[PDB]
Paper text:
Gasdermins (GSDMs) are pore-forming proteins that play critical roles in host defence through pyroptosis. Gasdermin (GSDM) proteins consist of an N-terminal pore-forming domain (GSDM-N), a C-terminal autoinhibitory domain (GSDM-C) and an interdomain linker. Recently, GSDMB was shown to exhibit direct bactericidal activity through its pore-forming activity. Shigella, an intracellular, human-adapted enteropathogen, evades this GSDMB-mediated host defence by secreting IpaH7.8, a virulence effector that triggers ubiquitination-dependent proteasomal degradation of GSDMB4.
Numbering used by the authors:
A (entry chain C): 3 to 90, 115 to 217, 247 to 406
B (entry chain B): 22 to 264
C-alpha cells in the first residue's frame, strides 16, 4: 500500500529511521494518532503495532471533574506545518503533532487506573510497548498517485518471472489524517531451523482435511486479500489459541473443525501452524491482493518452488540474525513463502 | 484622495490583468480588506500575480501560493508574515512588530538582514547560499531544505532546528549554550566528515540526527566506542548506520 510507501518516504526524508515509524494499515489510517496508545512488543515480529480498542485514554483514562479543561490540555496537540518534498517543487503539507515534555512529565507523575478493558489483559501479557508522541497528520485532502518499490527480493523476477508490472494505486488521503508516529516506551509500572520446524508441522498438518482446507483457502482469501479481514482472522485465531474453545458463529468454522482435528480435538500444532502462517504472511505486507489472486489461481506451488530454490540458497540470514535481534526482512519474506506453500501444499493434498 | 488612489490603481491592476485570474473575488476581498481593513488580509488561493500597495493598518499578512513577482514595502505589520510559495525576490525589512516570518517554499536566494526580536522563523525550501546573524529571541528555526553551506552560529533559545538536506560541509561552531529539553537538531543528509571535538561536551538532552553525512571511519568508530559502550551519556546522536 502507498500509505506504507509514502509514509516510509516521509520517514526517510523528514527524519530517516528515527523513532518516527510509518503507518502501514491503509484503511486503518487515523484509527490511531496522537493520544492513541496502540502498541506492544507482545511477542510480535519486532515491527508491529496492533490495531486494538486500546488507545491512550483507554489505558490511562482520567475520570475526575477536571476533564473539562483536560479537553483543551489533551487536544492541545501541535499543528506545525512541514513541507515534505522529493522526486516522487511538489510539497505535501504535513502537520507535526507532538505532546509536549511537560505533559510527558505529568503523565509520568500521574498513575494508571483500575477498570481497564479486557483487550488490555488480552494483549499486554508480555508487552514491552511503545506509545505515540510525535505524529504526522495530513491537513489537506491529498490524493496522490504512486507506483511501487522494494529491494533485492527481486530473485523472484530472476527465476523465470520478470516482474514488469505497474502499481498505479492512487489511495485517497482526506484532511486530518495520519502518516507516521514517534514511538517511545513507558512499559508497565507493575500495577530448529524453520525447515525442521516445518517438517514437524508438515507431519502434523499432513494430518489435515480437504473440504475444511477449502474453507481455509476461502477464509484466507478474505483475510489475506484485504487488510481488514487479516486482523479479523488474526484476532479470531489468537482467541482460538488462548481460549482454546469454539464459538459456532465463526465463518471460519471448517478450519475450526480442521485445527481441532478430524476427531474435534484442537491440535495445538495446527493452531500454532496457522499462526506461523499468519506471522509469515503479515510479514508479507500488502501481499494480500496477490495471495487472494493465488487462491483464485491454485498456483502457490509455483510461487514457493521458485522461492524454494531461493530459500535453499538463503539460510544464511535467519541463522545469522539472532531470534531476539533485528532480522533481514527480505530473508523473512523468503522463508515466509517457503512456509506458505510448503505447509499449504502438504495440506492441500489429502491426508 | 488616498483611498481614491488605492481604489483606482486596484481597478487598473484588476482589469489589465492578462485575463486569467480570480481577481474579481480578490477585488471585493480587497474592498472589504481596505474598507474596514480586515485582519489577516488573506490572499491565499486567489492567485493575485502582483500584490499592490497595502494599507497602513495591516496586522498579519497571509498570501500563500499567489504570485511570481516581487512584493512591495510591507511597512508596519503586526504579527505573522506568511508568504509561502510566492516568489524569489528579497524580503522587505522587518519592522519591530514582526515576530513570526514564514517564507517557506519561496525562492529568495539571499535572505536579507532580519533585525529585531524575531521569534518564529520558517525559511524552508529556499536557495539561501548565505545566512546573516539570527535574532537572540529566535526559538523555532526551520532552514530545512536549503542550499546554505556555511551555517553560522545559533541563538541561545533555539529548540527545534530542522536544516536537513543542505550543503553543510562543516558542523558549525555550535551554540551548545542552549539547554532545551530535547534539542530537535535535524542535520541529516549534510556534507560532514569533520566533527568538532566537543561531542563529549553536549548534554544527553540532544538528538542531532547527523545521518547522511560522510563521516570518516575514525570518528565513526569513536562514536561506536561511545555508543556500544553502555555509558552513552552524550547527545543521543543518531549516526548514519547506512540509513
Amino acid at each position: 500500500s502507498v500509505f506504507e510507501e509514502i509514509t516510509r518516504i516521509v520517514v526517510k526524508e523528514m527524519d530517516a529511521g528515527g523513532d518516527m515509524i510509518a503507518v502501514r494499515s491503509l484503511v486503518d489510517a487515523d484509527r490511531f494518532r496522537c493520544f492513541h496508545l496502540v502498541g506492544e512488543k507482545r511477542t510480535f515480529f519486532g515491527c508491529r503495532h496492533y490495531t486494538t480498542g486500546l488507545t491512550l485514554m483507554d489505558i490511562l483514562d482520567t475520570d475526575g471533574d477536571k476533564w473539562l479543561d483536560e479537553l483543551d490540555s489533551g487536544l492541545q496537540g501541535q499543528k506545525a506545518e512541514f513541507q515534505i518534498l522529493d522526486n516522487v517543487h511538489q510539497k505535501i503539507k504535513i502537520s507535526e503533532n507532538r505532546i509536549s515534555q511537560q505533559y510527558l512529565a505529568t503523565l509520568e507523575n500521574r498513575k494508571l487506573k483500575r477498570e481497564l478493558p479486557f483487550s488490555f489483559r488480552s494483549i499486554n501479557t508480555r508487552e514491552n510497548l511503545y506509545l505515540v508522541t510525535e505524529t504526522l497528520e495530513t491537513v489537506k485532502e491529498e490524493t496522490l498517485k504512486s507506483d511501487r518499490q522494494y529491494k533485492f527480493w527481486s530473485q523472484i523476477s530472476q527465476g523465470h518471472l520478470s516482474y514488469k508490472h505497474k502499481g498505479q494505486r492512487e489511495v485517497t488521503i482526506p484532511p486530518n489524517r495520519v502518516l507516521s508516529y514517534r514511538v517511545k516506551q513507558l512499559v508497565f509500572p507493575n500495577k530448529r531451523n524453520m525447515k525442521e520446524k516445518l517438517e514437524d508441522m508438515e507431519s502434523v498438518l499432513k494430518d489435515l482435511t480437504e473440504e475444511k482446507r477449502k474453507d481455509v483457502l476461502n477464509s484466507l482469501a478474505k483475510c489475506l486479500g484485504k487488510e481488514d479481514i487479516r486482523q479479523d482472522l488474526e484476532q479470531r485465531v489468537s482467541e482460538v489459541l488462548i481460549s482454546g474453545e469454539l464459538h459456532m458463529e465463526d465463518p471460519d468454522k471448517p478450519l475450526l473443525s480442521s485445527l481441532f482435528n478430524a476427531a474435534g480435538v484442537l491440535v495445538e500444532a495446527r493452531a500454532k501452524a496457522i499462526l506461523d502462517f499468519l506471522d509469515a504472511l503479515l510479514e508479507l505486507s500488502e501481499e494480500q491482493q496477490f495471495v487472494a489472486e493465488a487462491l483464485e489461481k491454485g498456483t502457490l506451488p509455483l510461487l514457493k518452488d521458485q522461492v524454494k530454490s531461493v530459500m535453499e540458497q538463503n539460510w544464511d540470514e535467519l541463522a545469522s540474525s539472532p531470534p531476539d535481534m533485528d532480522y533481514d526482512p527480505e530473508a523473512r519474506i523468503l522463508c515466509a513463502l517457503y512456509v506458505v506453500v510448503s505447509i499449504l501444499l502438504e495440506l492441500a493434498e489429502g491426508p | 484622495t488616498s483611498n481614491e488612489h488605492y481604489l483606482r490603481i486596484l481597478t487598473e491592476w484588476e482589469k489589465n490583468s492578462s485575463p486569467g485570474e480570480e481577481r474579481g473575488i480578490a477585488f471585493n476581498r480587497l474592498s472589504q480588506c481596505f474598507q474596514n481593513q480586515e485582519a489577516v488580509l488573506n490572499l491565499s488561493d486567489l492567485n493575485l500575480t502582483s500584490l499592490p500597495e497595502l494599507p497602513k493598518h495591516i496586522s498579519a499578512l497571509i498570501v500563500e501560493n499567489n504570485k511570481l513577482t516581487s512584493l512591495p514595502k510591507l511597512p508596519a505589520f503586526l504579527k505573522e508574515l506568511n508568504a509561502d510559495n510566492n516568489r524569489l525576490s528579497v524580503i522587505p525589512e522587518l519592522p519591530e512588530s514582526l515576530t513570526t516570518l514564514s517564507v517557506r517554499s519561496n525562492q529568495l536566494e539571499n535572505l536579507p538582514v532580519l533585525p529585531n526580536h524575531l521569534t518564529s522563523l520558517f525559511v524552508e525550501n529556499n536557495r539561501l547560499y548565505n545566512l546573516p546573524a539570527l535574532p537572540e529571541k529566535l526559538k523555532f528555526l526551520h532552514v530545512y531544505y536549503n542550499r546554505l553551506t556555511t551555517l553560522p552560529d545559533l541563538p541561545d533559545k533555539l529548540e527545534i532546528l530542522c536544516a536537513q538536506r543542505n550543503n553543510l560541509v562543516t558542523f558549525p561552531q555550535f551554540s551548545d549554550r542552549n539547554n532545551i529539553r530535547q534539542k530537535e537538531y535535524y542535520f541529516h543528509f549534510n556534507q560532514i566528515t569533520t566533527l568538532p571535538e566537543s561531542f563529549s561536551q553536549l548534554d544527553s538532552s540532544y538528538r542531532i540526527n547527523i545521518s547522511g553525512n560522510p563521516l570518516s571511519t575514525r570518528v565513526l568508530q569513536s562514536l561506536q566506542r561511545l555508543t556500544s559502550s553502555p555509558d552513552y551519556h552524550g547527545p543521543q546522536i543518531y549516526f548514519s548506520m547506512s540509513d
